[PDB]
UniProtKB/Swiss-Prot annotation, chain B:
Organism per entry: Drosophila melanogaster (Fruit fly)
Gene Ontology CC annotations of this record: cytoplasm; endoplasmic reticulum; nucleus; perinuclear region of cytoplasm; TRAPP complex; TRAPPII protein complex; TRAPPIII protein complex
Main location: cytoplasm
Domain of life of the native organism: Eukaryota
Subcellular location: Cytoplasm, Perinuclear region; Endoplasmic reticulum; Golgi apparatus
Name of the protein in question: Probable trafficking protein particle complex subunit 2
Any GO BP annotation: endoplasmic reticulum to Golgi vesicle-mediated transport
Length: 164, 139, 169, 123
């Protein structure tokens, strides 16, 4: 079902909300779960759904891994992608569909951040396992949005291989 | 004959596992092979990282050829460094052999109990590797 | 439609199990903890399976048995197969060939005393208790333990919901 | 002069390592490789010096072979990460080579160098 996953994920959040004391470390725990997901999904989908061939270059892998992960997760690719000049490290990936709202969401007083961070955790896993260590923030701006802070050695590395 | 040596390297450069099939003799010298090549997998890696930054090919058949030690690279989406090192060439075996390595690796990587860059002791994987070696390398 | 991929649910369940193994050292605690969360699952699973279909309350056990097998085939998309009745017809066994939760995961040998997919037994428990119906359910055979397919027991010891919807509460 | 002609650099190797295949004038070959290393080190091809120092290590002797392995070690590491722990692995063999005949000072300091990048790359 849709609703079985929503229920299992409510028990996710509740187990955290139990043996976790404050919200940001709860988001951290969600992020850990996301890393756990990515750690194996990325290696799965190298072959079956990613042309079986590796892709290394940044923006192509960003968009294509975005899409392939979303097709084999929900079958719905993220609606848009922004990469920001003002900070070349600052890219935003934004999807109007929150994974969270399979169960419609939490109290709007205590926890500013939600599953949005857990999806961001899966994102971080796949990026850093492709070769792209990054930190990702989930913001309630224009719906569920994300922002990625890549790795400095990585950012120099692709900035150099911007040419061949 | 051909010598047989497989290596598994975590993202954090951790040598996850290594597998052998060569005719057993002078085990001390086979361990010398192991560390020789495990530490050859070091520059091989320092090389093949930029080599993979060049080409995102299926498999990097050759990275270095020490004129007696041969470096064949099949790097993964999770950047798991894989190398076969041998005193003799057998390309057809090695290509789809690294393929089937990758396959059974996916199989035993899915299990949630495994975490990134961790040795895997599953003797089931050992016999899967052995069957592959008898298929694609050994006769 | 379920609008979701079986592997993603499997990964979330694996995330739970691994996180329990970490946070709490013992299998017995993590198992009782997950059984509690599954108990609390059932309190919503059973009302959902009622919202999809207002099944009859109960005239007999096997009526509840095929109701729940219908539900199992609903959310898990997998047709179960009831079997192994009591001489008294009170208790039966339930068969899952392959649970998306249970499958795509095998078990490290240290965790033999763990009962992995027990979240479903908890689900059944809480589902039967919000429906004010007293039953005992444990997986007599589990796919992981070397059993052919996951086998449960469903021991309906007594009743808590009456013939009139006033009931005892 | 500053021209640092890559043409003359490659010709030089054609009259050093490639001349070792023609005649047995290893004396003149090693003379060429020696200054070709320094001129290619000032250039940017430090891995070039290292590769021909490895092609001189196999011959050389014992103290000499270890000296050329130590030269190859730093040369390949200087240009780029390439050889960041295999250089250390081969100066462990060059370390005992120096000990057999390799300078005791050279032996200890190349061993210390190896241990430094071993801790850096413990795995």
């Amino acid at each position: 079902s849709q609703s079985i996953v929503a229920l299992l994920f409510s028990e996710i959040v509740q187990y955290s909300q139990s043996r976790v004391f404050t919200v940001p470390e709860l988001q951290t725990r969600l992020h850990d779960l996301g890393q756990d997901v990515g750690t194996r999904i990325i290696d799965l989908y190298f072959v079956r759904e990613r042309s079986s061939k590796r892709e290394t270059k940044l923006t192509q892998m960003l968009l294509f891994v975005k899409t392939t992960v979303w097709k084999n997760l929900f079958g719905k690719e993220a609606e848009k992608l922004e990469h920001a000049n003002d900070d070349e490290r600052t890219y935003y990936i934004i999807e109007k569909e929150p994974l969270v709202n399979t169960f419609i969401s939490v109290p709007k007083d205590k926890g500013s951040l939600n599953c949005a961070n857990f999806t961001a955790g899966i994102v971080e896993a796949v990026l850093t396992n492709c070769g792209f260590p990054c930190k990702v923030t989930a913001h309630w701006h224009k719906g569920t949005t994300y922002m990625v802070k890549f790795e400095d050695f990585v950012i120099a590395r692709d900035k150099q291989m911007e040419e061949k | 004959m051909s010598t047989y040596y497989f290596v598994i390297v975590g993202q954090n450069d951790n040598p996850i596992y290594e597998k052998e099939f060569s005719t057993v003799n002078k085990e001390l010298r086979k361990e010398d092979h192991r560390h020789l090549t495990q530490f050859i997998a070091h520059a091989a890696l320092d090389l093949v990282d930029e080599h993979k930054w060049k080409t995102a090919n299926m498999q990097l058949k050759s990275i270095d050829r020490f004129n007696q030690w041969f470096v064949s690279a099949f790097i993964t989406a999770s950047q798991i460094r894989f190398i076969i090192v041998h005193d003799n060439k057998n390309d057809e075996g090695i290509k789809n052999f690294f393929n089937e390595m990758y396959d059974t690796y996916i199989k035993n990587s899915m299990n949630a109990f495994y975490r990134i860059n961790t040795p895997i002791k599953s003797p089931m994987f050992e016999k899967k590797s052995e069957i592959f070696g008898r298929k694609y390398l050994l006769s | 439609a379920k609008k979701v991929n079986s592997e993603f649910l499997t990964l979330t369940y694996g995330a739970l199990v691994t996180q329990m193994l970490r946070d709490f050292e013992n299998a017995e605690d993590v198992n009782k903890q997950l059984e509690r969360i599954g108990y609390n699952m059932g309190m919503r699973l059973i009302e959902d399976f009622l919202a999809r279909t207002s099944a009859p309350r109960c005239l007999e056990m096997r009526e509840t048995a095929d109701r729940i097998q219908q539900a199992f085939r609903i959310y898990l998309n997998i047709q179960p197969t009831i079997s192994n009745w009591s001489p008294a017809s009170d208790e039966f066994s339930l068969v899952f060939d392959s649970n998306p939760l249970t499958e795509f995961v095998e078990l490290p040998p240290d965790l033999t005393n763990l009962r992995y997919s027990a979240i479903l037994s908890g689900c059944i428990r809480g589902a039967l208790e919000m429906v004010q119906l007293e039953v005992q359910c444990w997986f007599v055979q589990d796919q992981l333990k070397g059993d052919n397919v996951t086998e449960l027991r469903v021991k309906f010891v007594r009743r808590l919901e009456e013939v009139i919807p006033a009931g005892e509460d | 002069l500053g021209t640092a002609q890559r043409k003359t650099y490659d010709y030089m190797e054609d009259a050093i390592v490639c001349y070792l295949t023609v005649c047995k004038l290893q004396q003149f070959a090693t003379r060429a490789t020696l200054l070709s290393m320094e001129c290619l080190k000032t250039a940017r091809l430090y891995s070039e010096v290292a590769k021909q120092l490895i092609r001189m290590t196999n011959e050389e002797s014992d103290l000499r072979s270890a000296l050329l392995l130590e030269q190859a070690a730093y040369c390949f590491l200087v240009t780029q990460p390439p050889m960041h722990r295999k250089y250390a692995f081969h100066i462990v063999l060059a370390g005992n080579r120096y000990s057999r005949a390799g300078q005791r000072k050279h032996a200890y300091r190349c061993y210390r160098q190896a241990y430094q990048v071993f801790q850096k790359r413990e795995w």
